[PDB]
Every structure is written in structure tokens, then in C-alpha cells.
């Protein structure tokens, strides 16, 4: 039977970028042609592989990462990028092999009073490793004195909210992103096109 | 022995449409991806679009997205490029390219010969062919003048006279029209005995003619 | 977007020389770097794919190497017909394929003197209303050649336009044609029509002229 | 007790380089967003660069390829290396914690440091008194210095009421000149000492002038 | 890639009045991305309001901001002389962007200047240069005419002027004009005078001294 890409793309609710979802896809037949001709994508870039060659390729596992970011932050979901999203929320390797799919989700993830459910990480002592997930909510220490879990001066809550409103400019509008990674190990493949 | 034959280029007013075609031969066409690549006159190469083997997946460069359309008929072994809302910047030679199937990624292993698309609100004209007469060998040639736009193909004796021929690149004179020269050096002995006639063809205006060159 | 930078933009090397071209990428493209050759007026041809794989049918004097951001194309022994413009092209970003600016390779050779020939405007052209005097420089090297018009020993500028053929695949020589365009009323106003040529293969400027109606 | 103390401004020739410093106390540079904002004379505020706590750096287009931001955790200092400086780089440069985004605004700011890009030479000032005759006026003349700025205090800061330090005028010689004056009651001239403290930072010229009636 | 524009360029209001500063955006910007900065002359910019409406720590209550979308406003209730500064709005899209700023001038009643004249110091004269300084102290408005007269001859081409910013406490201006001469030219004349005309003066004011006395 077919690989469940619809459970990822057609999900009614998406994850915050800092707590990005990952779906491990294994032991199924992948139908990429119907996957890529379904919705209207404002962003479709692939790296190290062509979208049309995936029907011929086999992989040990396939990963589908999904989250929501700003319009102006979509550019950071690519190999060799830097910025608040790539450094502190979701990071791709320089030799990434896979595809990045994004579409505007204003009609889904924006509220009249503002949708503050979606968050991102703002402060972090160091950058993330590729495909690392950090869900810490510890108070960030920006000074010499310790915070001891008390947010105040030089002691910041590490997460910031997006607050999507449907009337913003597209740079500030919510975008749902799907990143397809292709794990090729020295093990029998479980996913073929 | 892979062939890609193109057609459909010509003149087009800005905002109008045009449809190019590329007919493939001698390979399993319906299992390869096909590309369109253009090259503005004097500039470099720009990738335009790609279409999957079955024709379901299509991907375009940002400079033509929502404005061009790529398609294919696998029962006809022909690739297409529909060009709507044409701007002056779209003026270029357009190539089709077969994708090589030896990599996980795209690359162009066989290219079509290219067809020229000129986006301009000017009219198409025909060439005047004035002969350049000779006076230790000699030189005679033909002068193609006052045509628009590029290009014009010039041969001698329907492709029978090869050696010694020089066709020069055109020059856009102040009149906006183009002027082109084509010469050929012959020995001074056979002047009044051997005949010399040049062939001119102007596809944008669909006009051809012949002309003899005497000293 | 991944920028591809080629160096040099142009180079001159003689037949038999070794020629290496450099292509750099704004970011790591792994090994997905391709090399294309484009003769003048001809479609590009694939030479090397994936940094260092020889395309079938390509001569063995071509090779490639490199990984990451630095890649080279090498012609071990330059042949005359290898005059062309050489492009690199990255395929790592498969939906945003980008080319380099190109490297034009020109064939270096011994100095060749041009054969100068002048042509008066035809009688079929004077019947129309215009008049064009065409001067021809044939088979010379290098390309740099000065063409100066003199009408009654009066310097002419603003009435003509040059045109050079691409380097010949056999002998690697160029050819120039200057077209002195002028009206018929301006044609009979003067008598002498000269064409002076300055070139590196000429110890003194050579002039081919004619008298109107003589 | 949070402070940002800047250094390294002054005169630099066109095409030369310069490195600014931003000593911090009350925050950890290596743990914060740290930015540089510059303000040309008489013009507005322009963001120049930023360093993330994780190390990533970013630069405005006007300085990309010429500036390099950096930090030193052990010295808790921010740095800005500026190369190939031209006339458009002359400005007051501020360091500030933050990047001007939600939950990350420019706060606090350093006092700034002036960078002058010209072919001239650093010249120290001459300080002359302005002697007085209900209320009287006295002052100091700071003449023939380059480049800006000089700072003038009175009685080492203990005299702020009625003090007017004027903007510098650019004399026809190319050197600057300003004046600082203070108005006092006429009766305190004999029973109060007035010292103006001139500081021309680009040359470490600190001069104190006692101003007495003649 | 959203351009912000401030209006007006300058603002002149009496103390106690209400100041309205605008920051217009070409596209709809979220309120939480906008901030206001104050910069008093010769000082660094200070954060006033962040998130369009939240008052920064230690900022007086009279400063308040509102607005959303394409129109953001900074309001200074009960305007004070010390509020004389330039105000910039700032926002982030792909990078920090600042507005062009808005100068806030403070109006006040007319004030006549106090004119003082300073002979060159004997220390400077020994160097071969004489600088005569005329001081116009705490006047309003800015318009003022200063004429140097040497031996009752009007001087032209050898003096420069400089005006201070509006005073943060009394909103007045001050001015200094420096007449520059060589030592040799200075010893050739006796009476040095600057004549001052200002709106607060019914008749021009002249301040003079005789070289040597
Ligand atoms: C999502 O649902 C639509 C129907 O609403 C369907 O056409 C599409 O194939 C689905 N997407 C995936 C990835 O299955």
C-alpha cells in the first residue's frame, strides 16, 4: 500500500517550528506524482535530487518534517542558510538531499484577534545541529547573574509568538512547510517510488 | 544518434502569444524529462522549465512562471512551450534539451538546434540582395539589406559551394533594420565561365530569392 | 540562488596548449557540476557531467575535477575546432538550475596579414537610392584591426559599421567587413573612396581605393 | 550598572581600515544579539550589522564585503572591522544589544564614536580663554583642531547651569573651531574659579583653562 | 521589504500641548514589530515604545503609542521643553529598518538676546592670530542678524556663526560669531563692535570694545 503523505500535508493543524513534527515513512510505495500535483505550492525547491526522478529511487526511510513559519522566513529552509529559524529552530545540512515544500496558510493559521499558538525560538546559546529539535522553555541567561527560572532583566523566556492576523503582509503571513528527507543507509530499502 | 528538431520561432508583438515545438527521435522519449533553455542575443544561458516524463509534473523558472507553459505529447514524441504575455526581455533563442538519466539530478545531454523568438512591435520585411562585383585571386559576394528581424540564412548553390564562403554577422543600422554581407573568394581565372548565385531565406517574413553576381 | 562564477572570462592559447577553466559556486553543490561547450551559432554540447564524468562521444582531451565550491575543466591538448564559449552549470538546486557566465576560449596563432579588398556600390543599388561601399579584410590574426574610411582623402566616421567573423575552425583567422552606407546624393558629391587598414601584420598601413566611375 | 563603552573612532584615510570596540558591562556579549547602527552627520539611523549569540553574522548591503563584526568573550567586547572606507562611511557608530525585532529591541545603546574619512591629518586644538568684562559671560575658544569632536565641560562637571557649547564651524583652513560659554552672576567673578575642560578625543588632547577677568 | 515613512518632518508645539507623530507603512505590518526611539541632541537613541504600544522601562507616562497595519502613532501628552528630540520609528522584516525621523521643536514666547563681546586673548595674539567673539545668549526665535563693525566699517567675509540646538530647559537659542584676523591686521584698528538685531529688540544692540583699553 501507499505511503501516507496525506497525513502530513492535509493535517488540519501544524507544529510550531521549534517543536517541528517529523513523520518516519517506511515499508510502503511512494507516489510522488500525485503528491506534487495536489495543492498549489508557493515554494518548491529540491536539492541533490529531482522531483521527477523520485519515482525511480528507493530509500531505507523517508522523513516528512512539517511546521509553520513567517513568509519572510521560508528562505532559511535551505542548505547553507543562517538566521533565527535555521540557527535556533530548524536546520538543514549543507549537503541536504531532499525537497522543501511551502504554501501560504493564511486562511488556516491566522485569526482575527491573532493566532498566537505558533511560536519560534528567539534566544539560544549556540546554533542547532542539522535535524535537531529543541523544546526547552528554560529562562535564557543573557547576563552574568543566574536566572533561576525567573524572567526579568537579562533573563528572557526563550520563545516568541507569531500572532498571525489574516490582514498582514505576505512576509508576515503563516506558511506551512514540508521537508522531505531521504535516508539512504547500507540496509535494505523500504520505500520505492 | 538522438535528434531534437525545433520550430515555431518568429516575430511577436509584446503581450501576444507564441508556441514552440520540439520533435524528438531515436530514444525512449516518454521516460525522460525534457527541458527548455533560452539564451538572449549576446548573453548566457537561462533554464526556463522542465516537464516530467509522463507530463504531469511541470516546474518553471521564476522569470517565466505563471506566464509560460510547458507540455508534451508522448504519442507524438514532441515537446511544447506555450509563451503568453511576451515581454521584450523574452527575446532569445530557445532550446529544448533531453535530460540525462545517469544522475539523480537534472542535466542537459542533448540539445535542439534552437529557434529564435523576437518580441517587437516592428514589422517584418524582405531583403534586398545587391551584388558585390570583383575587379592573386578575386572576391565576390552578396549584400542582404533592410530586413527585420534576425536572422537570414545565406548559402551558395543550395549548399553545394562550401569552401571559401564567408558570411558575416548582421549589423543593426540606424533604420532599425538589419544588413548582412556574405562573400566568397574564387580564383581570378574562372570569372566569366563559372556562375555564382547566392541563396537567401528570411523565415520571419517567409521570403526567399536568388541573384547572380557578375564582375 | 546559487551563483556560478567562472574565471577567466576570456583566454588565448595556441594549438596543443593545456587549458584549464575555473568555476566557483556561491555554496557547496556537492559534485553536481556540469560543463558545456558552445560553438558560435550552435547549440551547447555536454562535455562533463557530475564534476568529472566524460559524456559519451566527447574526445579524451577533455576532463574535469573538483568538489564543493571549486571545479575545473581541462583541455589537455587544444585543437583548432575547440574555439568556443565554455559554461559551467550547477545541478544541486535541481529546481533552480543556474549557469556560469561562460569562458570564451580563443586560439592563439602566428600573426597573419589581412588581404584587403574594396568594392564600389553596385549599379543595382544606385538605382534604389542608397549607396554602400564595402571593404573586406580576409584571413588575419589577431582580431584587432583598424579600418578607416577616406572619401576624397576626407576622413569618414558615422556612416559605416564593421562586422567580424568568428575564428575559423581550420586556420584560426578572422575576417572583417566594413559597410560605408551613404545616400546617392552624397555619393556623386565626391570622387575618391579609400579604405585604410592598420594591423599588426602590416609594416605600414595598406590602402585599397577606387575612383568613382573609373 | 549596564553600560556599553565604545572606542576606536577618529580619522582614517580613504581606502584605509579601522576597528571599533564596544566594551560591555551588565550583559554578556557572547550571549546576546549585538548590533552596530551608524548615523551620518545630520542624517538618520542605519543598521550596519549584527552578531547572533550562536555566532551567525549579518550585514547591510551598504557594508557587505567591507565590514566584519566580531566579539571577544573573555574581554566581553564587541568589535567592528571596517575596510575600504570611503566618504559615505563617515558617521557616528553606535553599538546596541538586540536586533530591533519583537522581544529583541535595540536596548541599551553605547554613547557612540565618530569616524571621519578624509585625506587630511589629525591636528590638536589650541584653547584660549574668553574673559568677562547683573550677569556676566565667560568662555573658552577651541581653535584649529581636526577632526571632530571635542567635548568641553566646566569645573570638571560641577558647572552645568547656563553652559552653552556651540557646534563646530569648519574654517577656510580645513580645521574646526568651537566655543563653550557659561553665564554667571557678575558678583561671583572674583570669588569663584572657572575651569573649562577641553577633550579632543582623536588626539588624547585634554586641556584645562582657568578663565579669569582681565 | 516594507518601507516606513514618518510625518511630519518637523513639529513646533508649545509646552503642555499634544504631539502627534505618524509612521506610515506601504504594507500592513504587525503592531508587535514596531518600536519608537528618542534621540536628544548629542546623545544616543533611547528606546521609547516597543510593540507599537508598550512603554519602555523608565519612560514617562506622557509618552504613548498606538496604531496597527499601515498607520502607527506616537503621542506625547503634556509636551515639555526637555522633550526636544528626534523621534524614529523602527521595524523588522528581513532586517532592521528605521524611519526618517521627526524633529519636535518647542514654541515659546519671544526672548531678546543678551549680547557679549570678547577680545582676543593675549595668549592667542602672540601666535599671530586674533579671534573676536560675539555671543548672543538665550533668544527666540532663531532668526538673528549679527554685523561686525571695525572702526565703524562693516565687516564682510571674515566671520563665521554657530547656533546651538533649542535649549532643553528654556527652549531658547544661543549664537556665537567669531571675527578672525591676523595679529597685524588686529593692531591696525581700535574699535571692534558687533551689532545685533533681533525681533525681541526694539532697536539694534551694539557691543564694542577699544583695543588696548
Ligand atoms: C489532500 O486532500 C486532497 C483532497 O482534498 C487530495 O486531492 C490530496 O491528494 C491530498 N493530499 C495528499 C498528500 O494525499
Residue numbers in the entry:
A (entry chain E): 334 to 526
B (entry chain H): 1 to 135, 142 to 221
C (entry chain L): 1 to 214
D (entry chain A): 1 to 133, 140 to 220
E (entry chain B): 1 to 213
From the paper:
S1 contains an N-terminal domain (NTD) and receptor-binding domain (RBD). The RBD interacts with the cellular receptor angiotensin converting enzyme 2 (ACE2), which is expressed on diverse cell types, including cells in the upper and lower respiratory tracts, allowing SARS-CoV-2 to cause respiratory infection.
B.1.351 also has three changes in the RBD (K417N, E484K, and N501Y), whereas B.1.1.7 contains the single N501Y mutation. All crystals also contained a further Fab, EY6A, as a crystallization chaperone (Zhou et al., 2020) and were isomorphous, and the resolution of the structures ranged from 1.95 to 2.67 Å (STAR Methods). In the original virus, residue 417 makes a weak salt-bridge interaction with heavy-chain CDR3 residue E99. Residue 501 makes contact with CDR-L1 of mAb 222; however, the interaction with P30 is probably slightly strengthened by the N501Y mutation, which provides a stacking interaction with the proline, conferring resilience.
